[PDB]
Design a protein around this nucleic acid. Structure first.
Ligand SMILES: [Mn+2]
Ligand SMILES: [Mn+2]
Ligand SMILES: [Mn+2]
Ligand SMILES: [Mn+2]
Ligand SMILES: [Mn+2]
Ligand SMILES: [Mn+2]
Ligand SMILES: [Mn+2]
Ligand code: NA
Length: 326
DNA sequence: CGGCATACG
DNA sequence: CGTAT
DNA sequence: GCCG
């Protein structure tokens, strides 16, 4: 009926159970804030199952037989179906712990562990953090300074402009190098939190050394508000009407031999890639990452020329990016 | 009961 | 520890 | 939290 792994089923960007999945993703997020990766995963997977359904869930019986729905996620849905709200979800929403961990972890440079420590120290607001900047990393100082712009959704119109400037710098750093839009925008999102790009070159090995050359050129054009190799987590200065705004941009380089694996990995979703790697290992005995796919019996790597190759080597029906919105 | 994706900066 | 999908 |  409904397969158990998210990589076994199309998941479109918009769907027929938005309210139910949003509620389960609250509980998933809260689990993460408490360090319960297992519960986070189950709530994420249950949410994604609903995203993959062809019509709205209207009755509790429609959950029977759906993978990843047990006592807890079913009770959440039952309450939403009966009352329009789930008391547990609402308790989380308005809890000081949830609101503060959400606020802190959304800072670039701050993870659950840092947020939790700050919470235990009594800190609650961004200005609480600004008062004692001696305890911040440079990365967190950047995330905090730019927090307001970074909280503003990036639009598809912003993306085309950014891509043009990235290509200009990439073309100077290495003629022939290519830039591919990845992440959520490649899955069809109309807005996002950041922009993800994958860079390669058709001649294996020519991409070596490329990212520092790209970064130096962007920085010389005055476009880099912050940066820290093959992955660069930047804050770009993006022109705006009569001004500009800070935007998070990720630049990644891969040799062309690895490009299909890095495209697949950086196109996501996060849950899709976790499920795909889990499927690969547990069902097929193969080890998948954004560099390659390894058979640990033969001790060999699978050559891929396309994402389609990778799906085929895993025995999965091909899913375009717009159906990977798990 | 063990497992829960797998990297890089 | 942070970051990424 | 759920699965196999
Ligand atoms: Mn429970
Ligand atoms: Mn009731
Ligand atoms: Mn992204
Ligand atoms: Mn990103
Ligand atoms: Mn590498
Ligand atoms: Mn256990
Ligand atoms: Mn993301
Ligand atoms: Na963060």
């Amino acid at each position: 009926w409904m397969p158990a792994y998210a990589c076994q089923r199309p998941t479109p960007l918009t769907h027929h159970n938005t309210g139910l999945s949003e509620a389960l993703e609250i509980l998933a997020e809260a689990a993460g804030f408490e360090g319960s990766e297992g519960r986070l995963l189950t709530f994420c997977r249950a949410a994604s199952v609903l995203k993959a359904l062809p019509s709205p869930v209207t009755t509790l019986s429609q959950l029977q037989g759906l993978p990843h729905f047990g006592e807890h996620s079913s009770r959440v849905v039952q309450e939403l179906l009966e009352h329009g709200v789930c008391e547990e979800v609402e308790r989380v929403r308005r809890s000081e712990r949830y609101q503060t961990m959400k606020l802190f972890t959304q800072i670039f440079g701050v993870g659950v562990k840092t947020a939790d420590r700050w919470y235990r120290e009594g800190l609650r607001t961004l200005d609480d953090l600004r008062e004692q900047p001696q305890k911040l990393t440079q990365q967190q100082k950047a995330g905090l300074q730019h927090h307001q712009d970074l909280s503003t959704p990036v639009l598809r119109s912003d993306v085309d402009a950014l891509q043009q400037v990235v290509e200009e710098a990439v073309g100077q750093a290495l003629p022939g190098a290519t830039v591919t839009l990845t992440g959520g925008f490649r899955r069809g999102k109309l807005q996002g939190h950041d922009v993800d790009f994958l860079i390669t070159h058709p001649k294996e090995g020519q991409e070596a050394g490329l990212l520092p050359r790209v970064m130096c050129r962007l920085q010389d054009q005055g476009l880099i508000l912050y940066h820290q190799f093959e992955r660069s987590f930047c804050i770009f200065r993006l022109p705006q009407p009569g001004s500009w705004k800070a935007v998070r941009v990720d630049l990644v380089v891969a040799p062309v031999s690895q490009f299909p694996f890095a495209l697949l990995g950086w196109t996501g979703s996060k849950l899709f890639q976790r499920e795909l790697r889990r499927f690969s290992r547990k069902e097929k005995g193969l080890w998948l990452n954004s560099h390659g796919l390894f058979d640990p019996e033969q001790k060999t790597f699978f050559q891929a020329a396309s994402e389609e190759d990778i799906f085929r080597h895993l025995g999965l029906e091909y899913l375009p990016p717009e159906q990977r919105n798990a």
